[PDB]
């Protein structure tokens, strides 16, 4: 299912290019080296509750 299969193993956005999974992140996040995890660049990344 690619993207339809557990979001293609992506942390956030999932797209299917060349019949393969391609992950991407929202503004303020950086795609990790595995090309699946999304890493925040600041202390208050969007979408995250400030629980600390």
């Amino acid at each position: 299912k690619l993207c339809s299969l557990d979001n293609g193993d992506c942390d956030q956005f999932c797209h299917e290019e060349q019949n393969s999974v391609v992950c991407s992140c929202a503004r303020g996040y950086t795609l990790a080296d595995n090309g699946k995890a999304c890493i925040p660049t600041g202390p208050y990344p969007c979408g995250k509750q400030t629980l600390e």
Binding site: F13, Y44, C46, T50
Partner: protein, 234 residues
């Protein structure tokens, strides 16, 4: 908000509150970035001059985390009309940048295709606001949140006495007594995906509140993603 629960410390950091010249909240909004707020177009009529307050969770007193911001530019969609309530969306550019901290942080804007396929197909969404706790009553002095199920589009079209356009969607309960209410308009509707909350809707309207056979109507954000983008530039 009718029913639901109190937003605990840090749980709804993207909530904004429009306050009138009397420092009283009439509508809600969602934080999009340090300079931008998302809200409803019909809220821009609930008052002439208004400001935006962030980091507030209890209206009665001042904890020390709140912040009032002045609106520099008001950007209401030019297709809105109180006759239909279609295109109920607006963007506010603040004069000063919001400083993120506890209870103050933006909600994520998702990509259209992914959002409609992955977020809006989830079971529920989250709505919040300082609105009325009962169809008839005073606004709430505490910020509240409520998990509302996505309603079948056909089911809601059937239950409504007004036309549900493609710029709206329904969320809520058929009979259960939980729903948004007067005062939560323009507020946020977000959807959670892997501990990350994305903005999926804007509190727009309802026939009464929590009424049986009636749901909540929200502006469909995925329908305005480009509009939102342009607005955050001009």
């Amino acid at each position: 908000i009718v029913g639901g629960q109190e937003c605990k410390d840090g749980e709804c950091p993207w909530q904004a509150l429009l306050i009138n010249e009397e420092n009283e909240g009439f509508c809600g909004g969602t934080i999009l970035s340090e300079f931008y707020i998302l809200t409803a177009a019909h809220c821009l009529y609930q008052a002439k001059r208004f400001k935006v307050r962030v980091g507030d969770r209890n209206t009665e007193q001042e904890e020390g985390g709140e912040a009032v911001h002045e609106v520099e530019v008001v950007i209401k969609h030019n297709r809105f009309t109180k006759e239909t309530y279609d295109f109920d969306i607006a963007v506010l550019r603040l004069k000063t940048p919001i400083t993120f901290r506890m209870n103050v942080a933006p909600a994520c804007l998702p990509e259209r295709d992914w959002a409609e396929s992955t977020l809006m197909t989830q079971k529920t969404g989250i709505v919040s606001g300082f609105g009325r706790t009962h169809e008839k009553g005073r606004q709430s002095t505490r910020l509240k949140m409520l998990e509302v199920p996505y309603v079948d589009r056909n089911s809601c079209k059937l239950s409504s006495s007004f036309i549900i356009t493609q710029n709206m969607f329904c969320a809520g309960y058929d009979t259960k007594q939980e729903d948004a209410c007067q005062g939560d308009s323009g507020g946020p509707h977000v959807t959670r995906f892997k501990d990350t909350y994305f903005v999926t809707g804007i509190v727009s309207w309802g026939e009464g509140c929590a009424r049986k056979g009636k749901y909540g109507i929200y502006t469909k954000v995925t329908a305005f993603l480009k509009w939102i983008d342009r607005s955050m530039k001009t």
